Design a protein around this ligand. Structure first.
Ligand SMILES: CCCCC/C=C\C/C=C\CCCCCCCC(=O)O
Ligand SMILES: CCCCC/C=C\C/C=C\CCCCCCCC(=O)O
Ligand SMILES: CCCCCCCCCCCCCCCC
Ligand SMILES: CCCCCCCCCCCCCCCC
Ligand SMILES: CCCCCCCCCCCC
Ligand SMILES: CCCCCCCCCCCC
Ligand SMILES: CCCCCCCCCCCC
Ligand SMILES: CCCCCCCCCCCC
Ligand SMILES: CCCCCCCCCCCC
Ligand SMILES: CCCCCCCCCCCC
Ligand SMILES: CCCCCCCCCCCC
Ligand SMILES: CCCCCCCCCCCC
Ligand SMILES: CCCCCCCC
Ligand SMILES: CCCCCCCC
Ligand SMILES: CCCCCCCC
Ligand SMILES: CCCCCCCC
Ligand SMILES: CCCCCCCC
Ligand SMILES: CCCCCCCC
Ligand SMILES: CCCCCCCC
Ligand SMILES: CCCCCCCC
Ligand SMILES: CCCCCCCC
Ligand SMILES: CCCCCCCC
Ligand SMILES: CCCCCCCC
Ligand SMILES: CCCCCCCC
Ligand SMILES: CCCCCC
Ligand SMILES: CCCCCC
Ligand SMILES: CCCCCC
Ligand SMILES: CCCCCC
Ligand SMILES: [K+]
Ligand SMILES: [K+]
Ligand SMILES: [K+]
Lengths: 262, 262
């Protein structure tokens, strides 16, 4: 009867959290959305007025452009899709459940293989993340034991959850700052935009509004892709570990509050 | 020393998997990509020649349209963003790490709150999924024990991993088929497109090329959103449980492989 109570309490808390978040976000974003819409309307009217065009023809032109931009065409020069490197970056995004959305399958037969490939790969990636977390905890315990032994001359040493959480937070902040050190001069962006992209990518959310390393020319274009791969991998591992630790702490807190409720 | 060997073997297998998948996907998609690009080029040339326009002006027009479409502006009459319900949809996609990408924050201040909200919510969602899996296993065990007891008259009854995997696969297939029964008449899609969307959404990949329930008018429009919410929640739970079970099986197989090798 305890487990059912815990499940119900968690569900209710999540629902309240969602309602509050929606209430805040609407008030934060509505006015900017409306201003952008009116700006686009005025620009469209000016363009349709200067060149004495019609209104339906521009609609057909824009529909064709939407189809083209879905295929992969963009106004600025971009790297081609579906080449060996582009396919490598697509499968890398697929197996980690990021899914930026800049490259998607378009033919029948290219979708079934996607289903089977993802089904077999996502489980392996999850197993890899779990093994990484176990190794990190073990090495932390060994380092702490060795440090204590060395300080004395002046297994059962596993650290608690709080210290693991602090270490993970510090590592994630350092990795994000180091990654945002680049991406600023290579691609024109603000530092805060780089941090926002790093958080969106590392948490495996992947909105797709900002995607890195596609400009059809990146000077060296060599070690840059390797660095991007390394940074994304490390960030994803650290963030997933942090989420698991936070979940453990939340479960302990729920246990306490339900014991208190009597 | 065994754990390090397991880690290294898993990493090597994942790398080989990625290379093979990239090769296959490129070989399947390159020609279609090239044909689409050529078609768009021909259409643009025809339009430019017909209306005696220049080439840079159309580029500026398309850049303005890209900026407008980065906001909540589409071609075929979509629902407004950030009113109250768009925010609810957005936060629902955020906390489940789907990230479709149809709605993104645009103002500074709306991004920091996103960071904190996601950091606190993703852990709770993961905990909810784990608790659901535990409850499902317990109820399966109870049902099996009760059925055996009833058949006889004509705790320690934990089912094995294989039966849990089979049950999860059957439930996921049934849920996906029932969901794809809808979305076919309400929105104009093929049945296979509905299945593809269901798999992409349930696995928390979320490419964003197909997003449901946005046309600014959906007849009843009251029960449709509730049904969409229920279906997505159930599918995500089932798929995550299946991924965890398959990961356990893969770990067992790796242990056997290491044991056999000397
Ligand atoms: C050697 C470690 C093996 C473990 C691999 C596991 C998971 C892969 C996860 C994430 C890879 C991120 C994809 C980015 C690819 C960019 C490549 C490019 O810019 O072209
Ligand atoms: C009562 C259940 C509590 C658990 C909730 C946990 C996680 C939420 C997960 C997924 C929600 C899917 C997106 C919702 C779509 C909005 C519907 C609409 O407006 O069209
Ligand atoms: C451990 C091996 C990982 C594989 C990393 C390969 C990524 C691709 C390398 C980048 C190749 C770009 C083409 C070179 C152009 C100079
Ligand atoms: C347990 C309650 C969770 C469901 C919360 C409400 C679902 C989303 C709102 C339903 C759609 C209302 C639109 C009304 C327009 C006719
Ligand atoms: C005894 C019944 C109490 C538990 C019911 C929980 C309802 C949550 C349903 C949504 C989970 C998919
Ligand atoms: C959905 C997330 C809600 C946050 C759960 C934490 C509960 C805080 C109580 C702490 C008491 C010690
Ligand atoms: C995410 C939890 C925060 C809850 C606070 C929401 C109440 C304020 C909403 C009204 C703003 C005008
Ligand atoms: C002028 C562009 C130089 C690009 C430098 C990137 C090299 C990073 C390699 C480090 C890998 C972790
Ligand atoms: C004995 C050395 C074990 C180190 C194994 C390397 C595994 C790849 C490192 C990248 C994972 C984040
Ligand atoms: C990385 C995905 C491939 C994992 C393959 C699993 C091992 C199969 C051999 C076990 C058969 C008994
Ligand atoms: C997922 C791994 C499947 C095996 C890949 C074989 C690669 C064949 C290349 C086909 C080129 C025509
Ligand atoms: C033409 C009217 C279509 C509306 C049907 C939606 C009913 C879904 C209810 C199912 C609840 C799980
Ligand atoms: C804390 C929950 C707030 C209730 C939602 C507000 C609806 C306008
Ligand atoms: C955490 C509550 C912040 C709400 C302020 C809304 C800004 C207008
Ligand atoms: C042309 C169809 C081939 C797709 C591969 C078959 C799925 C395993
Ligand atoms: C000019 C770019 C250099 C960025 C620093 C390298 C990453 C540590
Ligand atoms: C003007 C942008 C400042 C953002 C500061 C918040 C960083 C956590
Ligand atoms: C120019 C390609 C550099 C790639 C480095 C690979 C070393 C593991
Ligand atoms: C199984 C790995 C095959 C590697 C394919 C690379 C072809 C250029
Ligand atoms: C499973 C391998 C099939 C790849 C060859 C089909 C594409 C021509
Ligand atoms: C249009 C308002 C939606 C109903 C509010 C939900 C409160 C349970
Ligand atoms: C500009 C208002 C920012 C409010 C959110 C700050 C994060 C707690
Ligand atoms: C054109 C029909 C597609 C058949 C795919 C079968 C899905 C498993
Ligand atoms: C018209 C709204 C009906 C859906 C709400 C049902 C409450 C469980
Ligand atoms: C074009 C890149 C070749 C990759 C070999 C590892
Ligand atoms: C023992 C290997 C540790 C791996 C790198 C974090
Ligand atoms: C005991 C509750 C089971 C929940 C519904 C799958
Ligand atoms: C149960 C789905 C019925 C289909 C609605 C037309
Ligand atoms: K995602
Ligand atoms: K996306
Ligand atoms: K995800």
């Amino acid at each position: 009867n305890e487990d059912n109570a815990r499940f119900l309490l968690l569900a209710a808390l999540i629902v309240l959290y969602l309602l509050g978040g929606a209430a805040v976000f609407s008030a934060l974003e509505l006015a900017h959305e409306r201003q952008a819409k009116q700006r686009w309307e005025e620009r469209l009217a000016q363009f349709s007025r200067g060149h004495q065009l019609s209104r339906d023809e521009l609609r057909g032109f824009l529909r064709h452009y939407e189809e083209a931009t879905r295929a992969g065409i963009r106004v600025d020069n971009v790297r081609p899709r579906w080449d060996f490197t582009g396919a490598f970056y697509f499968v890398g995004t697929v197996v980690s459940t990021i899914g930026f959305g800049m490259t998607t399958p378009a033919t029948v037969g290219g979708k079934i293989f996607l289903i089977f490939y993802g089904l077999v790969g996502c489980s392996s990636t999850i197993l890899f993340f779990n093994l990484f977390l176990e190794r990190l905890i073990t090495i932390i315990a060994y380092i702490m034991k060795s440090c204590h032994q060395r300080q004395l001359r002046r297994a059962g040493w596993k650290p608690s959850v709080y210290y693991v959480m602090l270490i993970l937070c510090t590592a994630s902040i350092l990795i994000s700052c180091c990654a945002s050190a680049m991406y600023t001069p290579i691609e024109g962006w603000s530092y805060f935009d780089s941090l926002y992209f790093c958080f969106v990518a590392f948490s495996t959310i992947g909105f797709g509004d900002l995607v890195s390393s596609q400009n059809a020319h990146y000077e060296s274009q060599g070690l840059y892709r390797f660095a991007n791969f390394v940074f994304i991998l490390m960030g994803v591992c650290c963030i997933y570990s942090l989420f698991n630790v936070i979940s453990i702490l939340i479960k302990q807190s729920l246990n306490w509050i339900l014991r208190k409720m009597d």
